[PDB]
Scaffold this active site. Structure first.
Site, PDB file in Angstrom:
ATOM      1  CG  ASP A   1      36.884  21.831   5.852  1.00 54.20           C
ATOM      2  OD1 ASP A   1      37.875  22.058   6.572  1.00 54.20           O
ATOM      3  OD2 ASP A   1      36.923  21.011   4.898  1.00 54.20           O
TER       4      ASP A   1
ATOM      5  CG  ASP B   1      42.637  22.158   3.152  1.00 50.29           C
ATOM      6  OD1 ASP B   1      42.896  22.867   2.160  1.00 50.29           O
ATOM      7  OD2 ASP B   1      43.296  22.221   4.210  1.00 50.29           O
TER       8      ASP B   1
HETATM    9 MG   LIG Z   1      38.183  19.229   4.701  1.00 53.06          MG
END
Ligand SMILES: [Mg+2]
Ligand SMILES: [Mg+2]
Ligand SMILES: [Mg+2]
Ligand SMILES: [Mg+2]
Lengths: 245, 245
Positions: free
Chosen positions: B8, B10
């Protein structure tokens, strides 16, 4: 002695929405040895730039670039501050308009819907019942239905009536949308700034100078000497007869 | 022996919506000497590219780039064909959804409205009651009202009920909007394509792996070995303990 030639773009200097013929572009630079030159068009700057040169060449090739009817202005290469439609209309009338459009469109059943039904621009709101993020094929499909059902024409009728007397104007163009803009924000908008630049004469050239056309108001305004043209070649020819006789 | 590390973005590799720390970026290339590496994020490609390098460097720096949860895929520098949300949902349910949103929003009276209330993306519809074309100051104003009035939370409640059993999912994020997307179009979407690339092991790393988080489904899916992290530094540390012990 201080003269400006101010041109509409589509159908006046270029095939509509297409790149300028290099010979026309060549003449405009020659004309520039006698006068300053500007363009005014309803489309945003990026579209106008694309039609008239590579990259940002347009702001160097023309003394004035009035995009979105002059709500966006480049002056001798410099971008000037812009006014917002909300500042002019006020938040309350703006939202009354937005909510009427949202409410009306929710009741429209189309073959397809996408996104960006209301596009907030500098010089207008663009309303598109199908949604502006549709493909060309989708545009054409809508356009053909619209001719049968008069979807945009009927929406504009209801809006004009609902906001009667409140200073809104409407124009239906292209395949999927119509424009909503304040009274006065036709091409004449650019003239207020031009009034302060000490021109002896401003010559305006356009191909839609008849009533109903998008050049009518600026053509008929007493601040311009108006010229009706039918093609870019006619434009070049008129400019020769006047400035290179 | 054929291993993929899938991250992922962020809060896992970078500060949220910000550029990656060059040391983290440096480690990822070292990791790449032992395994292939990929990213999967909910944002569009242009945002992900901006966080992870200059220009389109991201598709060269990573073996896989899954934007919009994998509905957009770059594989070893190559863009793959994308599926449309209308193809998956069908035109009728899509428009039922669009018209419900248009109808609901027309009844919302806000301090300000702008444009782009419904943004058509590859992996979702983005619904924003204020209109996505607002300024940062306008975003913050809406965000503070939204916390008081629960405007987005109530809109999502009505939508979930209205489309009960029809396979739509919702997520409220950031200041002005919420996401509407089909069941299965969380981060797990990217796994179907990955299943065909003959990996012995796919390790997934995320900072939202608890129920309700946007990494929960892909983390818990039996096609991944899941890893919970709390920061980019934790991510780098976990990858050292596993691949450089
Ligand atoms: Mg995240
Ligand atoms: Mg014209
Ligand atoms: Mg005149
Ligand atoms: Mg798993």
């Amino acid at each position: 002695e201080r003269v400006l030639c101010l041109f509409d773009v589509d159908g006046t200097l270029t095939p509509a929405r297409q790149k300028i013929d290099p010979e026309v572009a060549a003449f405009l630079q020659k004309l520039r040895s006698r006068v300053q030159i500007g363009v005014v068009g309803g489309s945003d700057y990026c579209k106008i730039a694309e039609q008239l040169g590579d990259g940002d060449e347009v702001i160097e090739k023309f003394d004035y670039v009035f995009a979105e009817n002059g709500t966006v202005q480049y002056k001798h290469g410099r971008l000037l501050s812009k006014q917002t439609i909300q500042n002019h209309l006020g938040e309350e009338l703006l939202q009354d308009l937005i909510n009427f459009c949202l409410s009306y469109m929710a009741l429209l059943r189309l073959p397809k819907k996408r996104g960006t039904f209301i596009e907030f621009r500098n010089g207008m709101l663009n309303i598109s019942p199908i949604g502006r993020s549709c493909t060309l094929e989708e545009r054409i499909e809508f356009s053909e239905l619209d001719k049968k059902e008069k979807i945009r024409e009927k929406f504009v009728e209801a809006l004009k009536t609902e906001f009667a007397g409140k200073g809104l104007r409407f124009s239906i163009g292209g395949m999927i949308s119509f424009d909503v803009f304040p009274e006065g924000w036709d091409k004449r908008y650019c003239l207020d700034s031009l009034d302060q630049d000490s021109f002896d004469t401003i010559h305006f050239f356009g191909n839609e100078t008849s009533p109903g056309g998008n050049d009518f108001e600026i053509f008929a305004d007493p601040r311009t000497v108006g010229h009706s043209v039918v093609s870019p070649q006619d434009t070049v020819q008129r400019c020769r007869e006047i400035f290179f006789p």
